[PDB]
Amino acid sequence: IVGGTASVRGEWPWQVTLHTTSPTQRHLCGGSIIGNQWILTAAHCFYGVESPKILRVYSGILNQSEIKEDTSFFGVQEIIIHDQYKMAESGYDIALLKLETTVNYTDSQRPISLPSKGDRNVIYTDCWVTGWGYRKLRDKIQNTLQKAKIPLVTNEECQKRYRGHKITHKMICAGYREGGKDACKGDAGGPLSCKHNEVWHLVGITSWGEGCAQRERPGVYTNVVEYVDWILEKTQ
Ligand SMILES: NCc1cccc(-c2cccc(C(=O)Nc3ccccc3CC(=O)O)c2)c1
Ligand code: NA
């Protein structure tokens, strides 16, 4: 996250850190708890991943330094990538992880609701992007989970900033005109969480953009509401 601030314990209890374990153990991407054995994340995170055997999902983490050799984690039973996915920039950047066991919900780990059926006309004005990603293009994974409030921009405006790409209604965009706050490497797969009537909803999945926090180049996110039929079908 560029231009963010440190989160505190329990602040974003749906946020998980997905680690790979080979050839070293490291944070790969973010994800969101959406059900008792289900993480929603970005398909592009799994480039070159041979199988789910080399993944671990850690919930209830604030600082990456908390993770020790005896820290509990969930194995991944299945990786479900959208059948139309090809590359992040070309859309369908969405995947589900089915965990090997269930997540017991507490103040530090619980699910986030999807955008509600019937809420098409809701205008989200309180949206936050979170993660352990880089603070700029040439950086490293951050220790403490970062947060930044980012305004949505219309798809019409977003398309004008990305004339070499097809911005579709399966995407949404968020960023400031003068940049300064955005997601960056290591944040993909995590949530764009928006609060409406004091309930948080998973509006976007961090996906891609041109650089990080550059002026007039908003972050591009998977538009979760356009995938509810797909998510519900896979998780039923
Ligand atoms: N501001 C837009 C924005 C939003 C999110 C990520 C980036 C960004 C920047 C530079 C490099 C990368 C990258 O190599 N990613 C990658 C590739 C394969 C697997 C996992 C990942 C991590 C990931 O995507 O987080 C991503 C940019
Ligand atoms: Na769908």
Q: Which residues line ligand 1 (CB under 6 A)?
A: 28-29, 44-45, 47, 133, 182-188, 206, 208-209, 212, 219
- Give yes or no: residues 199 and 234 share one domain: no
Which residues sit opposite 199 in a β-bridge? Answer: 196
Q: Which residue has the tokens 């374990």?
A: 21
99 lies in the same domain as 134: no
Cα–chain-centroid distance for residue 181? Answer: 16
CA of 28 to the centre of ligand 1 (A): 10
The C-alpha atoms of residue 131 and residue 141 are separated, in whole angstroms, by 9
Domain check: are 115 and 213 in the same one?
A: yes
User: Which of 136, 157, 145, 152 lies closest to 203 in space, CA to CA?
Assistant: 152
Residue 46 tokens, joined: 């799994």
Instruction: Based on the fold, state whether residues 220 and 231 are members of the same structural domain.
Output: no
Label each residue of 18-54 as H, E or C: EEECCCCCEEEEEEEEEECCEEEECHHHHCCCCCHHH
Supply 159's token pair. 């398309």
Do both 26 and 101 map to the same domain? yes
CB 78 within 8 A of CB 98: yes
Counting from 1 in the atom list of ligand 1, the atom nearest the Cα of 88 is 24
Resolution (Å units):
1.2
**Same-domain pairing of 47 and 156:** no
Using only C-alpha atoms, what is the Rg of the chain? 16
Residues 6+ apart with CB under 8 A from 66: none
Tell me the residue type at 192. L
The bridge status of strand 15-20 relative to strand 191-196 is unpaired
Tokens of 71: 């820290």
Tell me, yes or no, whether 195 and 177 share the same domain.
Answer: yes
70 & 4 share domain: no
Whose CA is closest to atom 13 on ligand 1? 185
Identity (one letter) of the amino acid at 99?
L
Angle value at C-alpha 108, between 19 and 226, nearest 5 degrees: 70
Rounded CA-CA distance 47/184 in Å is 17
Shared domain for 81 and 128, answered yes or no, is: no
Tokens describing residue 77: 């039973």
134 shares its domain with 204: yes
Tokens representing 170 are 């399966």
Please check whether residues 89 and 123 belong to one and the same domain: no
**Residue-number span of the structural domain to which 27 is assigned:** 13-110+227-236
Which residue among 181, 187, 192 is best mutated to probe the pocket of ligand 1, counting the most ligand atoms within 8 A of its Cβ? 187
Residue whose pair of structure tokens reads 């798809």 in the numeric block: 155
Domain count of the chain? 2
CA-closest candidate to residue 74, choices 45, 37, 105, 49: 37
Report whether 131 contacts 1 (CB < 8 A): yes
Nearest CA to ligand 1 atom 11: 185
In the chain, where does DSSP find H-type helix?
A: 155-161, 228-235
CATH number for 70 = 2.40.10.10
Residue 221 shares a structural domain with residue 186:
yes
Q: Quick one: which of 100, 43, 49 has its CA closest to 77?
A: 100
